[PDB]
Design an enzyme around this catalytic site. Sequence first.
Site, PDB file in Angstrom:
ATOM      1  N   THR A 187       0.835  -1.238   0.000  1.00 26.97           N
ATOM      2  CA  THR A 187       0.000   0.000   0.000  1.00 26.97           C
ATOM      3  C   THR A 187       0.856   1.268   0.000  1.00 26.97           C
ATOM      4  O   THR A 187       2.016   1.251   0.425  1.00 26.97           O
ATOM      5  CB  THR A 187      -0.991   0.006   1.192  1.00 26.97           C
ATOM      6  OG1 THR A 187      -2.124  -0.811   0.873  1.00 26.97           O
ATOM      7  CG2 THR A 187      -1.477   1.421   1.531  1.00 26.97           C
ATOM      8  N   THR A 188       0.281   2.350  -0.521  1.00 32.14           N
ATOM      9  CA  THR A 188       0.843   3.688  -0.387  1.00 32.14           C
ATOM     10  C   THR A 188      -0.295   4.668  -0.134  1.00 32.14           C
ATOM     11  O   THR A 188      -1.302   4.667  -0.848  1.00 32.14           O
ATOM     12  CB  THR A 188       1.642   4.114  -1.632  1.00 32.14           C
ATOM     13  OG1 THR A 188       2.656   3.143  -1.899  1.00 32.14           O
ATOM     14  CG2 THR A 188       2.311   5.460  -1.405  1.00 32.14           C
TER      15      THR A 188
END
Lengths: 248, 216, 238, 233, 230, 213, 201, 238, 196
Positions: free
Chosen positions: G1-2
């Site tokens: 994730t970001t």
Amino acid sequence: SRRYDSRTTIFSPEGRLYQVEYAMEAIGHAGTCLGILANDGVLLAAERRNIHKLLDEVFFSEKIYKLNEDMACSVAGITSDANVLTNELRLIAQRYLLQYQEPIPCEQLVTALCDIKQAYTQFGGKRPFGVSLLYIGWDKHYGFQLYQSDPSGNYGGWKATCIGNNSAAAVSMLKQDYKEGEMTLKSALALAVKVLNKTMDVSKLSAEKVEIATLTRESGKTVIRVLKQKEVEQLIKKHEEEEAKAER
Amino acid sequence: TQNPMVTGTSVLGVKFDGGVVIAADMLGSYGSLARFRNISRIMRVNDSTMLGASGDYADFQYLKQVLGQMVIDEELLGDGHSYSPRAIHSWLTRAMYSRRSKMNPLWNTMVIGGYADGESFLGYVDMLGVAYEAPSLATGYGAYLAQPLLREVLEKQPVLSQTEARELVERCMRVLYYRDARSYNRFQIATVTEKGVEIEGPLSAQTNWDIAHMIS
Amino acid sequence: NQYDNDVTVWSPQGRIHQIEYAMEAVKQGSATVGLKSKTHAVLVALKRAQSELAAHQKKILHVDNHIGISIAGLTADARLLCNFMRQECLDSRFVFDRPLPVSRLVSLIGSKTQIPTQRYGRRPYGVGLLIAGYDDMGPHIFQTCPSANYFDCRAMSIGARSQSARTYLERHMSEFMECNLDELVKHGLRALRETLPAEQDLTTKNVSIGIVGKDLEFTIYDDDDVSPFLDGLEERPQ
Amino acid sequence: DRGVNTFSPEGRLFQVEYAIEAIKLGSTAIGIQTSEGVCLAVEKRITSPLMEPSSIEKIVEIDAHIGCAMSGLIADAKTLIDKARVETQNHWFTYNETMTVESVTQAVSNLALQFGEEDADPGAMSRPFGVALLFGGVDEKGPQLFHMDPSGTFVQCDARAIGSASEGAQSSLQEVYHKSMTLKEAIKSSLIILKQVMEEKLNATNIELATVQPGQNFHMFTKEELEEVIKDI
Amino acid sequence: AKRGYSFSLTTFSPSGKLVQIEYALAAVAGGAPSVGIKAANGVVLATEKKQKSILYDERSVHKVEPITKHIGLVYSGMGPDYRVLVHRARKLAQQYYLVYQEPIPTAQLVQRVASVMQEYTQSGGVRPFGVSLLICGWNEGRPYLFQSDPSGAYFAWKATAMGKNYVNGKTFLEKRYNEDLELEDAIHTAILTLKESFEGQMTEDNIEVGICNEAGFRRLTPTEVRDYLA
Amino acid sequence: RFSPYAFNGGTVLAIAGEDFSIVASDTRLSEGFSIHTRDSPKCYKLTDKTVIGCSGFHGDCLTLTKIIEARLKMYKHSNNKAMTTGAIAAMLSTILYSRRFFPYYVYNIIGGLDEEGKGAVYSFDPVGSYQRDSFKAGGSASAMLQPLLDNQVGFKNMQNVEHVPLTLDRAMRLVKDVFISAAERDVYTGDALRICIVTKEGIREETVPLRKD
Amino acid sequence: TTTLAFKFQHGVIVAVDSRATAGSYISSLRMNKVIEINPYLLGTMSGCAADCQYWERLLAKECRLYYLRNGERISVSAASKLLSNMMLQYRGMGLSMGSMICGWDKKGPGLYYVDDNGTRLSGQMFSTGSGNTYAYGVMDSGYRQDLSPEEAYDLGRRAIAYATHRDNYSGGVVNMYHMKEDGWVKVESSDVSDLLYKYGE
Amino acid sequence: SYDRAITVFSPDGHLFQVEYAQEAVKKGSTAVGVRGKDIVVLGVEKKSVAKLQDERTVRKICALDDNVCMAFAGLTADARIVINRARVECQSHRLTVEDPVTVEYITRYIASLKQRYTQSNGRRPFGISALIVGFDFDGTPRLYQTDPSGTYHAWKANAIGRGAKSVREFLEKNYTDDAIETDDLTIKLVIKALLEVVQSGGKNIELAVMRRDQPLKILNPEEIEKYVAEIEKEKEEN
Amino acid sequence: MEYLIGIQGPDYVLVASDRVAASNIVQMKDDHDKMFKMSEKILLLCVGEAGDTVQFAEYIQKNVQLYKMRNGYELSPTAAANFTRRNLADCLRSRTPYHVNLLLAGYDEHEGPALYYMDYLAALAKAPFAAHGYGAFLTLSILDRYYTPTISRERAVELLRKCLEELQKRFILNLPTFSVRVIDKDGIHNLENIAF
Ligand SMILES: [Cl-]
Ligand SMILES: [Cl-]
Ligand SMILES: [Cl-]
Ligand SMILES: [Cl-]
Ligand SMILES: [Cl-]
Ligand SMILES: [Cl-]
Ligand SMILES: [Cl-]
Ligand SMILES: [K+]
Ligand SMILES: [K+]
Ligand SMILES: [K+]
Ligand SMILES: [K+]
């Protein structure tokens, strides 16, 4: 089951609690107990109800209890209920010490027990403690202090007060004599003997019939002592000698 | 049960025309040791369903008394209702999963044969709550040895007579005795039908050891 | 009286008045009729309105696919028993995968309803139910009371003026076993009709019907779904 | 002396019947189910001009599509209202949807006879709630209005009134109701009947008005908006 | 299945008097007489053990009971209630010894036992004890005599009497008892106070007497009682 | 020690269209290197509008389906209506998460229709994280089914394809093709393929045979 | 994730990626990592997906209850604090969630960072996820409170897109939100790879 | 545990136990609170201290939080529990949520506590009414009051205790912008309303004031007597 | 890894704490405050586990505030420090212990300036000067070197300067900003933050 329930924690049509006010009557038949605040100390003076030729005298006191290093109390009412409350007072005082590592402030200890007594009037369906208590002590906040406790769980700070037999007559006697801000321990000890003599039943007054303890601050330490029989004897006779110098 | 003590090996099951047949050897093994060579691993639940069990024998005997009581309790009411072979299978699935989820499992693998409403029933129950239905069933080593035999016969002939099912089972018990180290040559055969449950006494599979001379 | 304030107090006659007072709650509720054939079990109840502006109260309730009930008495006690019946039916399907036999469910009511009648501070269930179900033994009509006692019956009616319905069913009880479903419901409607006063009769707004049997699962018809049953009516005679 | 779960010779619970009598002391509340929305109206009953106007909340929001009018002992009501608000958001969390007006009323009706002395929890109810409630809202079954009392019995209503003057307002609604009434006439009728059964005159600060219609959410009427509906007396 | 009452059976009357405690005080005041005397070098406790029939085995049950090595008990009032207080006092004596490794001070036992008596004047579904206890003991080289009553209150005595004719028994002791008695002299004046309220002739079976000194507490054998009865 | 889990294989697939939803799975139930049964479909009817597909530990799958079945009744008795596809998906999320610290070793995919009649597919993990999507595969051969669907249904990695809307006919063949490809490679996939089609008419089941080795 | 969030003169902007991974395989590439609690409340998801969804939705439920009871809505500070306490209840139990809480309230634009540990912070900029290091890089260089909405959107896109380029567990599409005094507006949902090619020229 | 229903409904529909608790507050000391423009001020009376008693202990004005204070009437023993329970809730609201407590929330909690004691087993209701005074974070002044039943209302000005019916009626006549214009006249409005019922004398009045942003101020017996000087200057004259 | 420091003088207590809120390898905040206001003259500085610090610090903070409301007066620096010690020591032999290292600074009207050091094990010790964190290993010697019990406030900030400069030069972690506050007769005063 509900047939046998006395309904102790219930309201009266007028908006009062019966068991509390009935417990107040028990205090009136108990020993006369007074407390007086002075500038350099504070004291308790109480009538001994346990008096006989055949009593042993083992303990230091009959009605005066040491609760803390800086606090002491006196009792009026049912002695067994008094023993339960005073033991609890000693516990709460120690729980505070364990937590904060300094003696419990006078007002806070009274507040704690009063919350227990109030709880007995609201829930549980149990009879309240038929005891009124007089607390004397010293803390670093308000100095020398005197407190009064009711079976209702209600308290108040006093400069001079009394509970027990002929209590209303004793307080009005104090209201006239007490000199606010000028009272020394020597003056308060003399007032205690004066009030007790007029209030008590057996008339003449004796060293076996009264019990006096003083709380003073000496050398940075709170000193609590229950007065010896030889000391009480002088306190009664000093009032006796002034009773002889009142006529001409 | 965290560690099983006395265990039973493979339990067989295959349904023929007008009923089901179950087989299990009368062995209770303590590790590799053959401890009890004459103990029944099969029970009769009622007149419609039967049960053969693998794994821990103490856990089987516990399930034997619980199921036994449930049939007793139901017979007392006498309301014209009885536990169907599917209902026992469903209860047992729920019982095993419940014990599994509490991390205290009943160390058992079950084969449930039954006959009700003109239909043959055969159900599998695992110690983890794995349950299904199959025309032929085999637990433990039977799943690797006896089950391949049953499937290959049932592929060529789906419907069998009671005699055909019996001789197939006896052929499977022969293979199990040859190839399982935790097996014994003393077994029982249970059968459900329109007449009810019938468990037959101590049986022995015919063995041939002529291949002992074919090493020179 | 002083033997009538608690369930744990026996009357000198050998009775418990609090159970009998709870039985009075059933009679005050509107009438409901239950009857069965060899294939079907039908519940017919009379909906009631406190005012014409307010809608009619629910009388028939769902329990399971094969079991349905009609209530008579206190609403909250009816909903409390209904939720217990639903839970027992759910537990049976969760464990055994087969529907709970009607006979056994009513026995669980008998066991549960008995508990509060023998404990101090507790009270009897102020509701009587008519249970219509279908299982392996065919259709069933059962009756429960504030007293934990229950009855297996061919036909029954409970509530206000249920005696009139009770007498009608008693005359035609031999008729029901060979009855067609459409004829069976009309018998239940004609019994419920007897409970009402002479001025008023069964309308589309105050009639609720529940049917369970061999053909279909338990189904409740209320308003527009009820009119096919009412139409084709033999007129109210005296 | 008797217990709380004691049946009368008639066949009723004493504490419940007495809780119904507690409603007959509460202020009058009226709800009307129109085919195009539901309106709720109640009198505040001002004891002193020192008391803040918008302080009394006898009509509250439970969900975006549900409103509730209360009568009787207000203290008991707000305990039931909070439970109703908890139920709607518990259901929203679990099912990702808005509850039906019937299911909300049913959820509150489950707390009905959940009172007793012995064989109960330390925090269990000692007595019933002295409250009658009017749940009015719009779900996928159109506009709906429900009535509930201490007995637990809940039912749908085309138009219902509850409070001190219940019978007087019920008869006034009885002769002035069409199932084809408009929302304009709905608020009008509730305002007309309200002044007739009250001891005090109708003011813009004296009453609460709420509307739940298919298009817009539950709306609390502002003083200026009340003056536009009281202009048509 | 059962669950007890949670409400007090002892409540305050309009007069301010806990009636059930005074009613419990009537139970002890009507019981068999008992007397205790503290006598400089020891303590004596004596009671009337008149079973009122020759059928009774006078050796089977005892009224003067040991709590520990150095403490004893006598009572006036009901026997069954007294037994409970004995068993409770014996446990309290052992609880103290396990924690402190020291024989429990008599004053500390009475305080703990009187606190148990207090509970039954306030707790739910229970009546107070119908017994007044007489506790003797020896600790720090000093004799001790205490009285515990239904109220939960405790008193320290040089000499006292309870039960039947407790008012006449006390006035007798006021004149007869003098401080600095010898233990053997104390047994005499204990039996003499017991003779004032007896009614009948005294045998070693009719009365029970226990003594407490530096050697501990023990009940006097029937042979020892006979020798003092002359 | 003792392991509360067993791997039983099985792959479940769901695709959403304009007025249809497809839930498909293999019929193979296995354990280790042996096959338990060849007749074990993973598709299950919940309502006339919603179908569930469970894969992984069969013990968990059986218990979880029975919980949903009971919760569907509990809902309809309390709300007087059937539980919607989106509501079942929202409910399954909470039931799976209630076992956060002792999870169901399960891969759930819900296929049905929304309130507008349009096809809806919900994909879950063993713990309860879910979302709506056009197509998703779950199970032992999910990595084999996905890339072909990304290319064909999603029109990914293509330049001048005119983007034709998904039909039932094309989706049915897509469902069959990916499972035939998976049965060739995945050892836990085979025997038979069962396809459940959710439409406005109801649930229709179809069976196509697969590799039995 | 970001995940990233920062605030400027014209409000708070929120940007996330869309990728979900199990080990090395990609479960989803359409994943929505923003939860719309309210018209003016926003939450982002990082860590364990199930843990994020359940708890942030539970926060959403409590935000709804708050609005009904007092009828005034909830402060961003209060909302973030509530979430923090829930994770605090479940300590040492291996819950894994990293999230940010965005809102507009009386204090003004509000940004918070909340942790599975129970960490709670307020700041101008935050980035959470496997690729947060890369997001910080581009964000820090090219950020000023003196930004225009168009420029802010550029930075959000840019940060996520470059993060996805470098990071294995970040990819898919950029979901951007703008928080305005009135409420949040969803700016765009643009494919990351296409953006990256555009940047390549 | 003690499981007896203390507060129950009467035949007429009354809660006697709640009504008796309302008799306890009517016997309580006179307490008045009034909201101003910039400040809010409480005032408590019927002190009647024996002058042999330290009056620092018997103060009926208590601070619950930095921005919230209260005054009570009735059973002073009961008050201490409610006050300390509210004080614990003040810090709990500060722990669960970053924000300080709003005046309405504290009032709602005290009201919910009093309500719970009317519907719970084994306990009698509180014999106190409270006057809650505080400021919102936005700065708008707030005044509330509770009673043994559990109901709460917002007030411009209100009085509770003995002579509440007399003081309340005075505030209705004397509550205009002419008396609230300044901060001094609002405090004078309290003293004038107070000295209107009590056994006359400033020595028996203890009143507290708090500004929009300033900490709570308990006034000196010097400061209040200076305002008593300004009321008698304009009593024989006006 | 964080840093705390306290220096007690004859009539004052100087305290400083770093302003870094760190996660794995990134600095999330440049201006994070690690000081907690307990009373008008009491400050509690906390360091340790990420979520455990704030929850524990605020719990004690709210209880010291509760004492003020219930009594009308504030706890003494000693009574406050012994209260925090009691709460941590009781959670030591439990299922969930708090790994927090704290520093309590206060001014009493009777006893005067006070500075208390406390372990995560909950061992309390009064010190003329103390420091928490890995930076303490580099700074306690500098404190030992130049400290006199009669140090002026002007010299105390200069002594703090010498300690914070050492953290810039030798300490491997980046701690550029520090919160600096002084407690005395008049209370807590916010002093210019030391930045590098
Ligand atoms: Cl001490
Ligand atoms: Cl289970
Ligand atoms: Cl009815
Ligand atoms: Cl009503
Ligand atoms: Cl009881
Ligand atoms: Cl569940
Ligand atoms: Cl997305
Ligand atoms: K009779
Ligand atoms: K009723
Ligand atoms: K909201
Ligand atoms: K705060």
